[PDB]
Amino acid sequence: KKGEWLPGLASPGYLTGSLPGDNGFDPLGLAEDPENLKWFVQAELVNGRWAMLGVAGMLLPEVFTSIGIINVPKWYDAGKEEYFASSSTLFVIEFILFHYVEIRRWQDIKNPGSVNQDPIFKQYSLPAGEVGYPGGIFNPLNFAPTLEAKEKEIANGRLAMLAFLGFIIQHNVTGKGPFDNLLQHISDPWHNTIVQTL
Amino acid sequence: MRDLKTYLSVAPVASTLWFAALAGLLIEINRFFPDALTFPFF
Amino acid sequence: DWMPGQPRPSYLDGSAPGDFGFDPLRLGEVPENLERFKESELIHCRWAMLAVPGILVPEALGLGNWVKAQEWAALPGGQATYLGNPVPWGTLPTILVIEFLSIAFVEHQRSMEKDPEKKKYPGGAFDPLGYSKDPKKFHEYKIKEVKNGRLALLAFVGICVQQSAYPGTGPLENLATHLADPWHNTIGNVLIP
Amino acid sequence: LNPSLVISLSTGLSLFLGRFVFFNFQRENVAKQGLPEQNGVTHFEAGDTRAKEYVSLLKSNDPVGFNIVDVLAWGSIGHIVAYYILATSSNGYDPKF
Amino acid sequence: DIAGLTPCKDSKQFAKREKQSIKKLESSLKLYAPDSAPALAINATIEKTKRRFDNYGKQGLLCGADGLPHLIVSGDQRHWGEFITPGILFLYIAGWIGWVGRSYLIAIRDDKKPTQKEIIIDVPLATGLVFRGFSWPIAAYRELLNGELVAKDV
Numbered sequence: 291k292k293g294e295w296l297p298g299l300a301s302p303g304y305l306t307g308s309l310p311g312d313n314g315f316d317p318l319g320l321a322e323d324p325e326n327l328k329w330f331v332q333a334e335l336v337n338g339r340w341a342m343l344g345v346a347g348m349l350l351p352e353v354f355t356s357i358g359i360i361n362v363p364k365w366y367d368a369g370k371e372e373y374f375a376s377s378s379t380l381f382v383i384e385f386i387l388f389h390y391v392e393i394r395r396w397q398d399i400k401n402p403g404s405v406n407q408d409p410i411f412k413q414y415s416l417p418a419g420e421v422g423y424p425g426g427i428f429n430p431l432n433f434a435p436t437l438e439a440k441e442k443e444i445a446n447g448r449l450a451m452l453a454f455l456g457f458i459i460q461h462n463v464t465g466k467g468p469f470d471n472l473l474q475h476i477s478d479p480w481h482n483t484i485v486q487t488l
Numbered sequence: 489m490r491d492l493k494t495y496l497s498v499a500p501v502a503s504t505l506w507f508a509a510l511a512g513l514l515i516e517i518n519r520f521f522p523d524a525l526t527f528p529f530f
Numbered sequence: 531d532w533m534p535g536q537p538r539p540s541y542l543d544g545s546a547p548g549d550f551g552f553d554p555l556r557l558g559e560v561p562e563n564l565e566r567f568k569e570s571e572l573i574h575c576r577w578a579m580l581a582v583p584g585i586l587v588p589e590a591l592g593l594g595n596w597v598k599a600q601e602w603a604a605l606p607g608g609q610a611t612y613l614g615n616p617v618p619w620g621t622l623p624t625i626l627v628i629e630f631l632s633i634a635f636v637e638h639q640r641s642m643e644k645d646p647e648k649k650k651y652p653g654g655a656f657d658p659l660g661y662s663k664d665p666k667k668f669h670e671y672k673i674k675e676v677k678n679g680r681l682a683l684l685a686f687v688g689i690c691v692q693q694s695a696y697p698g699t700g701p702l703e704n705l706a707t708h709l710a711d712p713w714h715n716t717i718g719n720v721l722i723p
Numbered sequence: 724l725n726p727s728l729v730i731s732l733s734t735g736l737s738l739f740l741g742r743f744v745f746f747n748f749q750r751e752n753v754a755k756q757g758l759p760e761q762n763g764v765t766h767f768e769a770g771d772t773r774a775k776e777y778v779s780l781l782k783s784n785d786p787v788g789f790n791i792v793d794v795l796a797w798g799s800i801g802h803i804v805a806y807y808i809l810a811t812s813s814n815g816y817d818p819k820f
Numbered sequence: 821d822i823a824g825l826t827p828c829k830d831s832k833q834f835a836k837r838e839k840q841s842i843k844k845l846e847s848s849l850k851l852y853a854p855d856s857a858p859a860l861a862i863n864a865t866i867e868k869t870k871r872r873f874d875n876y877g878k879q880g881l882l883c884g885a886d887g888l889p890h891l892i893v894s895g896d897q898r899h900w901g902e903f904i905t906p907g908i909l910f911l912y913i914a915g916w917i918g919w920v921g922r923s924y925l926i927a928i929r930d931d932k933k934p935t936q937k938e939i940i941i942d943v944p945l946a947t948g949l950v951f952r953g954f955s956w957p958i959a960a961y962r963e964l965l966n967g968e969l970v971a972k973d974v
C-alpha cells in the first residue's frame with residue numbers, strides 16, 4: 291500500500307506510486323495529464339524548498355533574539371531597517387542573479403543534461419542525475435539521494451509551505467511575531483485561540 | 489421515488505431551486521453588508 | 531549558441547559571421563528577407579561603432595555632452611563651434627542642405643549595387659591596406675567586426691536610455707555619478723523611484 | 724533673402740539631381756510600374772480615344788532622354804523647396820528651448 | 821483633486837445631503853407613538869442612513885458639486901477598491917461558472933442520447949464537477965498550453 295490520504299477513497303489511475311510522496315491525493319483533477327504532472331512535481335519541490343528556507347529563517351531568529359543572544363528585528367519589519375545599501379540596489383542585484391539561475395533551471399527542465407557543463411571552463415561538468423535532483427557539486431557531502439530521503443524532503447517541504455501560510459495569516463490578523471503568538475497561546479490556552487482573536 | 493429524484497432534476501425545477509438558493513445568499517449578504525460601493529478591505 | 535540547450539533555427543546553421551542561432555521571431559524565415567537583414571545589420575552596427583566615440587571623446591575633452599553640443603540649432607542666432615572655434619558656415623540651413631546633398635548622393639550610390647555580397651563587403655577602394663588577402667583571417671575579421679558592432683549598438687541604446695533618465699547629462703557624468711557612490715547610485719533609483 | 728538667387732539655386736539643384744542622380748532609378752521604376760490597365764489592356768486598347776500617350780513631345784535629343792516633362796516635374800520640385808525656404812526664413816517664427 | 825473632485829469628508833454638499841435626508845425621515849417619524857413598531861422601523865432606517873454616509877466618508881471616495889460619490893476607473897492605485905479588485909473578483913467567479921459548464925458539456929457529449937442529459941441534469945455528476953472551478957485559472961492555462969482548449973480544425 292503506497293499510502294492513502296483517505297483510507298476509504300480509491301486511487302486515481304494517473305498516480306502510480308512512482309514519485310516520492312505519492313499518497314494518492316488530487317481530487318480536483320489537476321494532473322490527469324502526464325505533461326501537467328511533470329511540470330507540477332517540479333513546482334512542488336521548488337516551492338517547498340523556498341518555503342523551508344523562508345520559514346526557518348523567519349522563526350529561528352525570533353527565539354534566538356527572544357532568549358537574549360542577538361538582537362534581530364521581526365521578519366515583517368526587517369525590510370525597513372537601513373542596511374549598507376539601498377533596498378533598490380539589493381533588489382536589482384537579486385533580479386539579475388535570479389534571472390541567470392532560473393533560466394538555467396528552465397533549460398534543464400526542458401531538456402535534461404543540456405545545461406550541465408560549465409560555460410566558462412570547458413571541463414567541470416555535472417554527472418547525469420535527474421530533474422528536480424541535481425547532485426554533483428550541488429551535493430558536496432555526497433549523501434545518498436535515496437528513495438527514503440526524497441519522501442523526507444517533500445514532507446518537510448509541504449509542512450514548511452503550511453508554516454508559511456500560517457505565519458502570514460497570523461501576522462495579518464493578530465499583529466505580532468509567531469513566537470509571541472505561540473507562547474501567549476501556550477501558557478493560558480483555553481482562552482487563547484483564533485476565536486478570541488476574531 | 490427514483491422517478492421523483494429524476495423529475496426534481498428536470499430543467500425548470502433545477503433552475504428554480506438554484507436561483508432561490510442564490511437569491512437567499514445574496515439577500516443575506518446585503519442584509520449584513522449594506523450599501524456597498526467599494527471593496528473596503530484591501 | 532545564444533542559449534545553450536535551445537534548438538537552433540533550421541535556416542540558421544552557424545556559418546554566417548555572427549550566427550549564434552538567435553531569431554525567436556522567425557523574421558528571417560524568408561531568405562530574401564534575411565539577405566537584406568544582414569546588410570541592414572552591418573549598416574546599423576557600423577554607424578553605431580562610429581558614433582559612440584563621437585559621443586564619448588569630446589565630453590571626455592573640455593566640451594559639452596552629445597545633447598548639449600546640438601542645442602544652438604533651436605535658437606535663431608545659432609552658430610556652431612568645433613574645438614572651441616566659431617564655425618564659419620555654422621548656421622543651420624546651410625548645414626541641413628549640405629548634409630542632405632552629400633548623404634543622398636552616397637546613399638543612393640550604395641543602393642545602386644546588386645552583387646549581393648558587395649552590398650555588405652564591397653572592398654576595393656574601401657580596403658586600402660588589403661586585409662582581404664586570405665579567406666580564413668578574412669572570416670575571422672568579419673566575426674570580430676560584427677561582434678564589436680553588436681556591442682556598440684548595445685552601448686548606444688544604453689546612452690539614449692540613460693539620457694532620458696537623467697536629462698541634461700553625459701555618459702561620463704553618469705560613470706562619475708556611479709563611481710561616487712556605487713552601492714547607492716544605480717538603476718534601482720530609476721526603476722523604483 | 725535675395726529671392727531670385729535662392730530660387731534659381733534651388734531649381735538648378737533639383738534639376739541637376741533629377742538629371743544626374745535619380746534619372747536611372749526613376750526610369751526603372753516607371754518602366755516596372757507601366758501604363759494603367761483596365762481588364763488586362765491599357766486604356767487606349769479598350770477604346771478610349773483621349774487616353775493615348777503623347778509620343779510626339781516625349782521624344783528628346785538629350786543623350787539620356789530628359790524631356791519637357793522631366794524638366795517640369797523636377798523644376799517645380801525646386802520651386803516648392805525655394806518658396807518654403809523663403810517663407811519660413813522670413814516668418815519671424817521662433818520656438819523655445 | 822483628480823478631475824476636480826474634492827473628498828466626501830471635506831465636502832459640504834455631501835453633509836447637506838446627509839442631514840436633509842435624515843431629518844426628512846425624522847419628520848416622517850414624529851407620529852404613531854414614540855415607541856410603536858413604525859417608530860422603531862423609522863429609527864432603524866435613520867441609523868442605517870448614518871452608517872452609510874459615515875462609511876462612504878471612511879473609504880475615501882470622491883464627491884463633485886452634486887454632493888454625490890463619483891468613481892475613478894483609470895487604474896490609479898488610490899481607487900482599486902472602486903473597480904479593479906471587484907473586477908478581479910467578478911472575472912474569477914464568471915470564469916468559474918463558465919468553466920464548470922464547459923466541463924459538464926464535455927463530460928456528457930459522448931452519451932448515446934446527449935440531449936437527455938441537457939434537459940434532465942445529472943446532479944451527482946455536476947456535484948463532482950462544481951469544485952473544479954476553484955482552480956479553473958491554472959487548469960485553463962495548462963489547457964491552453966496543451967493545445968487542448970481550442971477545438972482543432974474548426
Ligand code: CLA
Pocket residue numbers: 452453455456457459460463464471472473475482483484487
Ligand atoms: C500548520 C502549522 C501551524 C501551526 C503549528 C500553528 C500554530 C498556532 N497557530 Mg496557526 N495557522 C496556520 C498554521 C499553523 N498554526 C495556517 C496555515 C493558518 C491560516 C489559516 C493559521 C492561522 C492562524 C491564526 C489566525 C491564528 C493562529 C494561531 C496559532 C497558535 C494558537 C493555536 C491555534 O489557534 O491554532 C491555529 C488556528 C488555525 C485556524 C490554523 C489551524 C491549523 C490547521 C488545522 C493545520 C495544522 C494541523 C497540523 C497537521 C497539526 C499541527 C502540527 C503538529 C503535529 C506539530 C498556535 C501556536 C492563533 C494565535 O496565534 O493565537 C493568538 C491565531 O491567531 N493560526
Ligand code: CLA
Pocket residue numbers: 894895896897908911912915957960961
Ligand atoms: C484607455 C487607456 C488606458 C489604459 C489601457 C490604462 C491602463 C492601465 N493604467 Mg492608466 N490612465 C489612463 C489611461 C489608461 N490606463 C489615463 C488617461 C490616465 C490619466 C488619469 C491614467 C492614469 C493612471 C495611473 C495614475 C495609473 C494607471 C495605471 C494603469 C494600469 C492599472 C491596471 C493594472 O495595474 O493592471 C492590472 C492589475 C492586476 C493586479 C493584474 C491582474 C489581472 C489578472 C491577471 C487578469 C484576470 C484574468 C482572469 C481572472 C485569470 C486569467 C485566466 C487565464 C489564464 C485564461 C493599467 C495597465 C496604474 C499603474 O501604473 O499600474 C501599476 C496607475 O498607477 N493609469
Ligand code: CLA
Pocket residue numbers: 532542546547548549550551552553557558564566567568569570571574680681683684687
Ligand atoms: C536594426 C539592427 C539589426 C539588424 C537589422 C539585425 C539583423 C540580424 N541579426 Mg542582429 N543584433 C543587433 C541588431 C541588428 N540585427 C543588436 C543590437 C544585437 C545585440 C543585442 C544583435 C545581435 C545578434 C545576434 C547574436 C545574432 C543576430 C542575428 C541577426 C540576423 C538574423 C536575425 C533576424 O533576421 O532578425 C532581423 C532584425 C530585424 C527585423 C530588426 C528588428 C526590429 C524590431 C521590429 C524592433 C526591435 C525592438 C527593440 C527591442 C528596440 C529596443 C529599443 C529600446 C526601447 C530598448 C539578422 C540578419 C543572428 C544571426 O544569425 O546573425 C547572422 C544572430 O546570431 N543579431
Ligand code: CLA
Pocket residue numbers: 576577579580583650651652653654656657661662668671672673674675678679
Ligand atoms: C570593430 C571595427 C571594424 C572591424 C573589425 C572591421 C572589419 C572589416 N571591415 Mg569595416 N568599417 C568599420 C569598422 C570595422 N570594420 C567602420 C566603423 C566603418 C565605417 C562606418 C567601416 C566601413 C567599412 C567598409 C566600407 C568596408 C569595410 C570592410 C571590412 C572588412 C575588410 C577590412 C579588414 O579586414 O580590415 C580589418 C579591420 C581592422 C583591422 C579593424 C582595426 C581598425 C582600428 C579599430 C581603427 C581605429 C579606429 C579609430 C581609432 C576611430 C576613429 C577613426 C575615425 C575618425 C574614422 C573587415 C572584416 C571592407 C570589406 O568588407 O572588404 C571586402 C569594406 O569595403 N569596413
Ligand SMILES: CC(/C=C/C=C(C)/C=C/[C@@]12O[C@]1(C)C[C@@H](O)CC2(C)C)=C\C=C\C=C(C)\C=C\C=C(C)\C=C\[C@@]12O[C@]1(C)C[C@@H](O)CC2(C)C
Pocket residue numbers: 315316317318319320337340341343344345347348364365366368369450451452454455955
Ligand atoms: C514559497 C513559500 C514561502 C517562502 C518564504 C520566504 C522565502 C520567506 C522569506 C523571508 O523570510 C525571509 C527569509 C526574511 C524576512 O526578513 C523576509 C521574508 C521575505 C519574509 C510558501 C509557499 C506556500 C504554498 C502553499 C501554502 C501551497 C498550498 C497548496 C495547496 C493548499 C494545495 C492543495 C491541493 O492541490 C492539492 C495538493 C490537490 C488538489 O487536487 C486539491 C488542492 C486542495 C487544491
Ligand SMILES: CC1=C[C@H](O)CC(C)(C)[C@H]1/C=C/C(C)=C/C=C/C(C)=C/C=C/C=C(C)/C=C/C=C(C)/C=C/C1=C(C)C[C@H](O)CC1(C)C
Pocket residue numbers: 342343345346428429430431432433446447449450452453454456457467468469471472
Ligand atoms: C542540499 C544538501 C546536500 C549537501 O551535500 C549536504 C547538505 C549541505 C546538508 C544539503 C543541505 C540540505 C538542506 C539545506 C536542508 C535543509 C532543510 C530545512 C531548512 C528544512 C526546514 C524545514 C522547516 C520546517 C518543516 C518548518 C516547520 C515550521 C512549523 C511547523 C512552524 C510552526 C508554527 C507556526 C506555523 C506558528 C506558531 O506561531 C509557531 C509554530 C507553532 C512553531
Ligand SMILES: CC1=C(/C=C/C(C)=C/C=C/C(C)=C\C=C/C=C(C)/C=C/C=C(C)/C=C/C2=C(C)CCCC2(C)C)C(C)(C)CCC1
Pocket residue numbers: 734738794795796797798799800802803806
Ligand atoms: C538648354 C540646355 C541647357 C540649359 C538648361 C536650362 C537653363 C534648364 C532649366 C529649367 C528650369 C528653370 C525649369 C524650371 C521651372 C519649372 C517649373 C515647372 C516651376 C514651378 C513652380 C510651381 C509649379 C509652383 C509655384 C507656386 C505657386 C504658383 C503658388 C505659390 C508658391 C508655389 C511654389 C506653390 C544646358 C546648357 C544646361 C545643357 C544643354 C541644354
